[PDB]
Amino acid sequence: QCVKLNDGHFMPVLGFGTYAPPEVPRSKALEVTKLAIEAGFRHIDSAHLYNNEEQVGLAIRSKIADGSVKREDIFYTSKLWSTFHRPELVRPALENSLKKAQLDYVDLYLIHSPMSLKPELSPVIFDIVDLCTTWEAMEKCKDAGLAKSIGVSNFNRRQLEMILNKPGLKYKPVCNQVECHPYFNRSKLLDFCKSKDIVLVAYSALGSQRDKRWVDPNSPVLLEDPVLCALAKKHKRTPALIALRYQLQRGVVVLAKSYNEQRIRQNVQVFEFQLTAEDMKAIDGLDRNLHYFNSDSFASHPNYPYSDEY
Ligand SMILES: NC(=O)c1ccc[n+]([C@@H]2O[C@H](COP(=O)([O-])OP(=O)(O)OC[C@H]3O[C@@H](n4cnc5c(N)ncnc54)[C@H](OP(=O)(O)O)[C@@H]3O)[C@@H](O)[C@H]2O)c1
């Protein structure tokens, strides 16, 4: 089950999220990425930021070498971190991710965030960079064959239009990877992306990992929502599967992180059932503009995506 991107390539609609906090041994990323592939995951989402591209690439390479899959079956994503937005730093950063993962190309390279940072990953000191020049450098990475497709992450409508209306544009972003779940369903952004043939990719679709460093512990726990729990009972599934199936039926490609073997195998059950129209309407009604990731300290950045929240 894949969706056709605006550049002709195909993206599996269910992806495996590989981020785990530093307290989790790096060995786990190798272990679970293999478990994900064995369970049926073909879309693997990583990033320079996650400090796991070595282990994630090892897992993909091992499952190719053991005959389980071919490289063409795997959709691997990495992301350009914000300290490498200056156009001369874009390609070296991609080559470095390819070297670490021992891959010849990524299937998808994304701008991780529009909020450019001073050329340490977290120096916070900002950098003024016209993202159109960053995008031009990304386009050259696709022309060189290092990235099959290119896209963006954490862009708002205004920032997408800055790219879509760039003079001399060669490649539209194939996708915009943003926070998306029933408490923050991005309906307006989703309609906009659909109208421009851009795929919205959902992260934190299961409510986020609720890390005390980024997430307010008092924020509501998505997977304990009464509506998702009732719907989980009706369909004999789980709240997680309801939240994942919700995204698929509204045209969103959805990521799901799990470092637990049983839940990794569970999340591929999203293709085994359907939600009713009334089920989807009830989930729609949970929307409350709730971002689990508190970026309020970065609200001063000229490219802060959540501007005009009030
Ligand atoms: N571009 C960006 O800025 C950005 C930001 C955030 C995330 N992402 C990407 O999106 C991925 C997913 O988002 P996320 O990391 O916030 O996590 P998530 O997908 O919202 O999942 C949150 C938690 O759900 C739990 N879970 C998974 N399946 C479950 C199930 N069937 N039943 C119950 N609990 C379940 C997992 O815990 P267990 O591991 O214990 O199962 C996991 O820690 C990330 O790993 C990353 O690849 C990108």
Ligand SMILES: Oc1cccc(-c2ccc(Nc3cccc4onc(O)c34)cc2)c1
């Ligand atoms: O230019 C800037 C400026 C300010 C903040 C940021 C910034 C952008 C994305 C992230 N991401 C994540 C955070 C926590 C858990 C995660 O799991 N997966 C992820 O991607 C992720 C963190 C910081 C970029």
